[PDB]
Amino acid sequence: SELDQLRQEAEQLKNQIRDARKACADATLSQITNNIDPVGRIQMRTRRTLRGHLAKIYAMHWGTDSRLLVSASQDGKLIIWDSYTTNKVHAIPLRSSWVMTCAYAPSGNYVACGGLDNICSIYNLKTREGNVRVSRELAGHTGYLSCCRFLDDNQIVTSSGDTTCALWDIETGQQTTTFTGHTGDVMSLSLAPDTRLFVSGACDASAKLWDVREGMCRQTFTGHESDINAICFFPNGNAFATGSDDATCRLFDLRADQELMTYSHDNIICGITSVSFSKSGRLLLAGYDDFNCNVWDALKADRAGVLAGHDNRVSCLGVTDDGMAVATGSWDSFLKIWN
Amino acid sequence: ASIAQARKLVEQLKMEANIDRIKVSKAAADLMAYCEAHAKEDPLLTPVPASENPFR
Amino acid sequence: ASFSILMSPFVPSTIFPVVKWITYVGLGISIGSLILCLIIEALFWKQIKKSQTSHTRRICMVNIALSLLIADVWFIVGATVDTTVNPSGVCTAAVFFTHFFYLSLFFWMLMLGILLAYRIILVFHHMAQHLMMAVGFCLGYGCPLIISVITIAVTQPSNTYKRKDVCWLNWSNGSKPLLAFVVPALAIVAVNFVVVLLVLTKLWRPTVGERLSRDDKATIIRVGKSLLILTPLLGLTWGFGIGTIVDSQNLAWHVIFALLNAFQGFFILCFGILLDSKLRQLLFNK
Amino acid sequence: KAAVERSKMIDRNLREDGEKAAREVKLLLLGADNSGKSTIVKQMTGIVETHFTFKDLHFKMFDVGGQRSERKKWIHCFEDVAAIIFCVDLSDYNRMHESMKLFDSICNNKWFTDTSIILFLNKKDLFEEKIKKSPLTICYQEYAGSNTYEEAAAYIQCQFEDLNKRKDTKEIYTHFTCATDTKNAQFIFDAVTDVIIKNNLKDCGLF
Ligand SMILES: [C][C][C][C][C][C][C][C][C][C][C][C][C][C][C]C(=O)O[C][C]([O])[C]OP([O])(=O)O[C][C]N([C])([C])[C]
Ligand SMILES: CC(C)CCC[C@@H](C)[C@H]1CC[C@H]2[C@@H]3CC=C4C[C@@H](O)CC[C@]4(C)[C@H]3CC[C@]12C
């Protein structure tokens, strides 16, 4: 049998990979940014408190204009909010109440949903006939849909619970490209600012960087020891941060191919649920299962602030494109806008 | 079954092996440079005045 | 005073020397018990309470607690002032407030008692939380106020509203203003008592389906705990008022009525809140 | 403002559907493959939602088990359920070992620390004849006691109820399913109406 030889060949490749990373591991960003002044204690107040959901809020997505906000709840209703005036614009009656993700198109015309129903539903907001309708119903995933993001009005990438990410074409409703390689259930994905390459975190404690045009895993990052739940790129696009079930946020560099920072504290023992970056990337916001968020300095790993004020586990959060405010949706059916 | 998976798995490592890796310190400086370049364009970092704050 | 006057047409002279000591201690610790009960409740009023049904009980408990505290301080100052030096300045005002607040306390326990009956037989019937809150305040305060105003608008012009010995509603033989307090007190207790038995039947329901006996004496300990906490909050200790009405000369009934009801503040902090394991651990640690 | 009036209209629809969904029982259905779940759901892809109305009460049942993924990553969304319906196939013997493990996992979740179980022992009619062909005592390493149905059936209940570590906060309801289905839906309603009655006692500080 040649299986034993192949495993040995794979094993020595992993040793070469870690040795190559160890060569550049001598320098650490923690000891480099000691000269820069710390951001200090930062305060954020709930400018708005969006309410109206009748169940736990699992996902939200900010609008491309930093004004509209879409959130999904287990009540079966998808609501597009007007963050400036707290008003409500739409309320979609999702066919399946088990929704776990929602995306808002960069053109502001489409909203996507998915969850335990094993399908991705896309709704046309700009309908000339009045009420919104299900534009397309993407199907083909054998596992629960964990995340979905819009590349453009005709391209969407979905993270499923079948250890497989896929790229879909809305016009034909077929998987243009299928991404495989994860040995665990994929939980989240993030798109680069140029929407060319994306990285997804799975339950195998590994984050893999993919190429949309090709459909191959360019890089693999293994720094966690538990399930990875949050993925977010740096604004530059050359780095990203991961949130896991160990209360640890790790910053990985695409070019260096190695973990740089480890944002963790002794007090926190819960798991990360969502992470986000500011416009400048200096401030890192991470959700937590201990009923409140945290603010981390992305260059010094110092807890700059706390976003307490939620009565249940924080399930989702996001920062606007203009970086004017940060929203947060917890399990207490309340959305809060912080600034 | 498992033989095919092993053949494909070892090919992925070889493709990932022959990639260009820059020094961490060089990559670390790029992250710090980006934060300093866009520090003034971060309303969260610098308290925005209520006059121009849309959420005031 | 003896604290029996609330339900006693006449207080025998032999009980007064011995009954006054226990009630003053009982009223004294009742004031302290209510202060701690309100303080601990105020801090954790909404931090841990989120259920819709639990929302109604919190407002009922503070209303019962608030009524007892202010009524007790009105009662203690209503018996320590002479009825001749200030027959209207401090004596007349205290009697009306004491009578009205006690009526509000009795009527609030009816709302709590009806609430338990509502969630037991009408398990699937759901009204709005605000609608239940509005009707509870209307009957909790408005109904005692309706009875209170007519008490001072009928007996007072006849100059039979004041007992000579103590600042409290007179008994007399022709005019009986005390019936405006005795009758509602027994009516609430009687309505609360059938509510008590309704809870007992639900705890004693037979096994559903083919379930085995499994644990033994598990239901009986719940019954003992339920009566321990439900009795003071429902004012079941006020049922002795009928005993002092009929005879008003028994040595034992005046003692038990005084000690149990004067200690009701202690039976609220120790049994209503401390016995509740949901809030017991959250308070002892810090 | 037209936008403000639009929000007010949306709010009415949200509350109108909220009170409609507030009367839904929202049960959860579990069990082994081909473990009689079809009979308990059809008496009248991922998870399937089935609705039946009994005594002016609408019930929702979610047949979890078709996901075939990491259950702990999506089992927290099935909280606030009235109870858990479990189906055990008494006729099958090899599937009983995995059924106990599945029952063990669901009852010990941190989310399901208070939800009751209305487990159903299905195929009791076929268990009478099948036990004669293969005795329960011989098939299992553990002793099954007397070969009579009055003790063998009760032995299965002992092996299932003892898996519940939270005896005080959980009330397991057991029933045997037969060919008739008129009383099958009655037990679910009786078990559910007992749970909500009991649940009010904890919220009222009585239980
Ligand atoms: C402030 C806080 C708040 C307060 C609390 C309380 C209030 C109110 C009370 C109540 C409420 C209302 C009532 C309901 C009834 C109905 O509707 O329905 C009846 C029939 O169904 C009849 O029923 P029967 O069975 O006949 O009986 C009944 C009796 N009870 C007692 C329940 C009344
Ligand atoms: C269940 C326990 C703890 C509390 C019971 C409280 C009530 C129901 C009790 C306490 C005192 C009792 C009274 C005591 C004496 C008499 C005189 C006679 O005519 C028999 C009935 C009557 C009038 C009783 C009626 C019931 C009563 C009012």
Numbering used by the authors:
A (entry chain B): 2 to 340
B (entry chain C): 7 to 62
C (entry chain R): 567 to 852
D (entry chain A): 10 to 53, 182 to 230, 241 to 354
Q: What wording appears in the published article?
A:
Adhesion G protein-coupled receptors (aGPCRs) are essential for a variety of physiological processes such as immune responses, organ development, cellular communication, proliferation and homeostasis. A defining feature of the aGPCR family is that most of the members are autoproteolytically cleaved at a highly conserved GPCR proteolysis site (GPS) in the GAIN domain, which has been suggested to be critical for the maturation and function of these receptors.
Of note, a similar stalk–TMD interaction mode was also observed in the miniGi1-bound structure of the proteolysis-deficient ADGRF1, which shows that the cleavage is not required for the stalk exposure and subsequent stalk-induced receptor activation. A similar stalk binding mode is observed in the structure of autoproteolysis-deficient ADGRF1, supporting a cleavage-independent manner of receptor activation. Indeed, the proteolysis-deficient mutants of ADGRD1 and ADGRF1 exhibited a wild-type level of basal activity in our functional assays. One possible explanation for this proteolysis-independent activation is that the receptor may exist in multiple conformational states; these are likely to include a portion of receptor molecules in which the stalk is released from the GAIN domain, which leads to a collapse of the original folding of the GAIN. The dissociated stalk tends to interact with the receptor TMD to trigger G protein coupling, which, in turn, stabilizes the stalk–TMD interaction on the extracellular side, and may subsequently induce the stalk exposure of more receptor molecules by altering the equilibrium between different conformational states.
